[PDB]
Amino acid sequence: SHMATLKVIGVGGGGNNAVNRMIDHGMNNVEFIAINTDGQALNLSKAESKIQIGEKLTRGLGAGANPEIGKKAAEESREQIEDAIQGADMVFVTSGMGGGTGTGAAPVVAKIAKEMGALTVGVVTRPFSFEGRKRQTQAAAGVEAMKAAVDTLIVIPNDRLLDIVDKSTPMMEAFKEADNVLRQGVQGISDLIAVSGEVNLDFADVKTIMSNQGSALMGIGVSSGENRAVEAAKKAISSPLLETSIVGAQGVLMNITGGESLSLFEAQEAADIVQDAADEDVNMIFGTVINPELQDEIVVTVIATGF
Numbered sequence: 001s002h003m004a005t006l007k008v009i010g011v012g013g014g015g016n017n018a019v020n021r022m023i024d025h026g027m028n029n030v031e032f033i034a035i036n037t038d039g040q041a042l043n044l045s046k047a048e049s050k051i052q053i054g055e056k057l058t059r060g061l062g063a064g065a066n067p068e069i070g071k072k073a074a075e076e077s078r079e080q081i082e083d084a085i086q087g088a089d090m091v092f093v094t095s096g097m098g099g100g101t102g103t104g105a106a107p108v109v110a111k112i113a114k115e116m117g118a119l120t121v122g123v124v125t126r127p128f129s130f131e132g133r134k135r136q137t138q139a140a141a142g143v144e145a146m147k148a149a150v151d152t153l154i155v156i157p158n159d160r161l162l163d164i165v166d167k168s169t170p171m172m173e174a175f176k177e178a179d180n181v182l183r184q185g186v187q188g189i190s191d192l193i194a195v196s197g198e199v200n201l202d203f204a205d206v207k208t209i210m211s212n213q214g215s216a217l218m219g220i221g222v223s224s225g226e227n228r229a230v231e232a233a234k235k236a237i238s239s240p241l242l243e244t245s246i247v248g249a250q251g252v253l254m255n256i257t258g259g260e261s262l263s264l265f266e267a268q269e270a271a272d273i274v275q276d277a278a279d280e281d282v283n284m285i286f287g288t289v290i291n292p293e294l295q296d297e298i299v300v301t302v303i304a305t306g307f
């Protein structure tokens with residue numbers, strides 16, 4: 001009866017990089033929108049829907065690290081952005097904070113999406129420390145503006161990427177690990193909506209956990225074998241890339257997908273892992289999906305808010 005529409009909007013270079021890499025990986029039922037001041041970069045976007053903002057302000061160049069230019073560019077293109085969003089039930093805005101276009105335009109895009117009725121989720125990066133204190137301060141202002149504009153916000157500090165590489169890991173491989181946060185979160189919600197569960201969660205439950213909540217965690221864990229449920233739940237909540245850990249979470253949406261072997265005992269174990277790591281009394285919205293195609297695999301998806 002309700003087919004929820006999910007859109008992913010990349011704003012500025014980093015955001016559109018993430019969109020491009022997600023399209024390459026392959027997403028389905030999700031619509032992509034690319035927004036940038038930089039017309040050269042936008043010509044290379046793989047997104048179906050492309051919005052060049054601020055052409056008169058920038059002559060098709062970027063914003064030159066000036067967020068006021070990105071903000072004014074987005075505000076002047078409000079009607080085009082509205083038209084591209086219209087009909088979305090959920091919008092993910094992804095951007096790299098610290099530059100001019102993402103920093104300034106992404107909070108405007110998020111504000112428009114929320115004013116258009118969409119549940120609005122931001123997934124943004126903070127710059128590497130080696131980019132310097134000015135970039136970090138500009139980024140921090142962007143994060144605060146994002147938080148004011150979205151329903152929920154996931155911040156990925158790029159410094160955390162330095163914790164998951166070895167001395168030879170290619171930069172692009174590291175960047176794909178940061179992309180997975182957004183990609184797997186979107187996929188988890190898409191799967192929740194598309195698939196009827198035995199204990200069934202719906203898009204209204206996503207809205208209840210995410211609407212007007214501030215910081216968020218979105219995680220997926222997959223495991224097989226002995227202790228799979230605990231192992232998958234620990235993976236869902238323990239990403240090394242997040243600014244907002246699970247600790248302090250007051251509300252959680254947790255969905256467990258398994259085959260016909262999914263036991264009640266292991267569902268409780270998984271729920272307990274999440275409750276205990278939060279170190280809070282967590283208001284949980286718990287779901288389960290029986291996918292008989294799965295054999296020994298179990299998948300735990302977690303959305304945590306209420307920090």
Ligand SMILES: Nc1nc2c(ncn2[C@@H]2O[C@H](COP(=O)(O)OP(=O)(O)O)[C@@H](O)[C@H]2O)c(=O)[nH]1
Pocket residue numbers: 011012013014015017018062063064065095096097098099100101102103125126127128131135158175178
């Ligand atoms: N993780 C990640 N961070 C990025 C990527 N591209 C840019 N960044 C970060 O995003 C910040 C903003 O750069 P960019 O998005 O290109 O600037 P803009 O086009 O003016 O918004 C940079 O300072 C980097 O910290 C990317 O592909 N992945």
Ligand code: ALF
Pocket residue numbers: 012013037038061062063064065066099100101102
């Ligand atoms: F690419 Al920009 F400010 F638009 F760094």
Ligand SMILES: [K+]
Pocket residue numbers: 192193194195196197200201202
């Ligand atoms: K469902």
Ligand SMILES: [Mg+2]
Pocket residue numbers: 012013014038041062063099101
């Ligand atoms: Mg750029």
